[PDB]
Amino acid sequence: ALERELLVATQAVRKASLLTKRIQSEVISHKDSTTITKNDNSPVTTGDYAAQTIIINAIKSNFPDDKVVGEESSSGLSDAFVSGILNEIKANDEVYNKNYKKDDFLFTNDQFPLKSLEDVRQIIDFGNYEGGRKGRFWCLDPIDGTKGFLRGEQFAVCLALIVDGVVQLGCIGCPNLVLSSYGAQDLKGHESFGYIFRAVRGLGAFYSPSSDAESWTKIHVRHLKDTKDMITLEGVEKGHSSHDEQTAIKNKLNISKSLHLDSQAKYCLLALGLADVYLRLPIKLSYQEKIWDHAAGNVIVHEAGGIHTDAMEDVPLDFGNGRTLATKGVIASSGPRELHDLVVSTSCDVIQSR
Numbered sequence: 062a063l064e065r066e067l068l069v070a071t072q073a074v075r076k077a078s079l080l081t082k083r084i085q086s087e088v089i090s091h092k093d094s095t096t097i098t099k100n101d102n103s104p105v106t107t108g109d110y111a112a113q114t115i116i117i118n119a120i121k122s123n124f125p126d127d128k129v130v131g132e133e134s135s136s137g138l139s140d141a142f143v144s145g146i147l148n149e150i151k152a153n154d155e156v157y158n159k160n161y162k163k164d165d166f167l168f169t170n171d172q173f174p175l176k177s178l179e180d181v182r183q184i185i186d187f188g189n190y191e192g193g194r195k196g197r198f199w200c201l202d203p204i205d206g207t208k209g210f211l212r213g214e215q216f217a218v219c220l221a222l223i224v225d226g227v228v229q230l231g232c233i234g235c236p237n238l239v240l241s242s243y244g245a246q247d248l249k250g251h252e253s254f255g256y257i258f259r260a261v262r263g264l265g266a267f268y269s270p271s272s273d274a275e276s277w278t279k280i281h282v283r284h285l286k287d288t289k290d291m292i293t294l295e296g297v298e299k300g301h302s303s304h305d306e307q308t309a310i311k312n313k314l315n316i317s318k319s320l321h322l323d324s325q326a327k328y329c330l331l332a333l334g335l336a337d338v339y340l341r342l343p344i345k346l347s348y349q350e351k352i353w354d355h356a357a358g359n360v361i362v363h364e365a366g367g368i369h370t371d372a373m374e375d376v377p378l379d380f381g382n383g384r385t386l387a388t389k390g391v392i393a394s395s396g397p398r399e400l401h402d403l404v405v406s407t408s409c410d411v412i413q414s415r
């Protein structure tokens with residue numbers, strides 16, 4: 062009954078998924094002029110900003126008063142860098158409108174026309190909400206897995222709607238995701254810009270090739286009986302999670318198969334039933350996960366029939382605490398409860414043994 066909201070989220074993510082797919086090599090080749098280092102030393106690129114611009118501008122054209130928690134800020138960007146953001150958006154418009162445009166849907170309007178450099182800045186900075194416990198706000202990681210994006214590997218365009226601290230809607234575009242690499246079948250049309258996954262709480266999880274996004278296929282986690290047959294999902298970047306502790310969990314559970322990839326694409330593989338357990342144990346216990354790294358995934362996994370908690374206490378994640386999660390680490394799985402609890406208590410015991 063977030064009908065309008067689901068359509069808006071889907072088409073916003075779809076457009077940003079094409080831009081990011083198309084731009085990936087040009088960004089990599091021109092790292093010098095396309096890539097900025099933030100205050101925590103992490104990267105941000107033209108792609109991240111462009112995707113955030115398209116998405117917030119679409120949300121605003123359809124829902125002018127809506128609040129957004131977005132990862133990125135325009136502060137300090139030069140005009141030259143911002144003209145580059147605008148140019149990629151307009152370039153992508155020229156390809157997208159020929160080939161994929163959806164009738165009776167607006168990305169821009171009179172109030173938010175997305176025409177000038179000042180427009181791009183204003184739009185990006187509508188992402189400056191700090192979240193919290195009451196009411197409605199959108200939650201946006203324009204490129205999740207920016208390091209993957211830059212490695213030429215996996216990444217995801219991630220958008221969710223939170224209401225009263227609970228994620229009600231999620232949409233994840235995985236523009237580079239090829240299912241045949243994870244043993245499974247690809248759907249016709251997947252080749253151009255990957256797949257989109259999406260869910261509304263209480264109504265199920267679905268996917269579609271991003272080029273299509275009209276015909277939607279219901280997804281669900283699988284239910285293997287023995288952990289010895291299970292498959293983990295873990296990140297690639299050793300600084301984003303505690304790989305050695307994760308290997309200790311696997312070894313204790315007799316898991317011998319894992320997949321490493323960047324981004325909330327991992328949640329999508331889980332929801333699809335191509336793996337069983339998403340492990341993200343914290344390296345340092347002071348880190349607080351950003352809600353935009355987990356919010357879209359939370360509702361997609363839930364609707365696909367899985368379970369999503371922190372990595373120590375075995376409690377549900379609380380998306381009403383602001384920009385960050387107060388718990389430590391994240392673990393999701395296909396369930397059931399007993400399997401999930403086994404995984405999280407192992408993770409607990411591992412961390413306590415430090």
Ligand SMILES: Nc1ncnc2c1ncn2[C@@H]1O[C@H](COP(=O)(O)O)[C@@H](O)[C@H]1O
Pocket residue numbers: 205206207295296297298300301302322323324325343344348351354
């Ligand atoms: N020290 C850290 N611990 C946990 N996550 C981090 C850390 N540093 C950066 N990140 C996040 O890791 C996210 C991507 O996770 P992934 O692609 O699964 O490795 C980025 O979007 C960052 O927000």
Ligand SMILES: [Mg+2]
Pocket residue numbers: 103104105132207
């Ligand atoms: Mg980042």
Ligand SMILES: [Mg+2]
Pocket residue numbers: 109132202203204205206207
């Ligand atoms: Mg990001």
Ligand SMILES: [Mg+2]
Pocket residue numbers: 202204205206353354
């Ligand atoms: Mg992220």
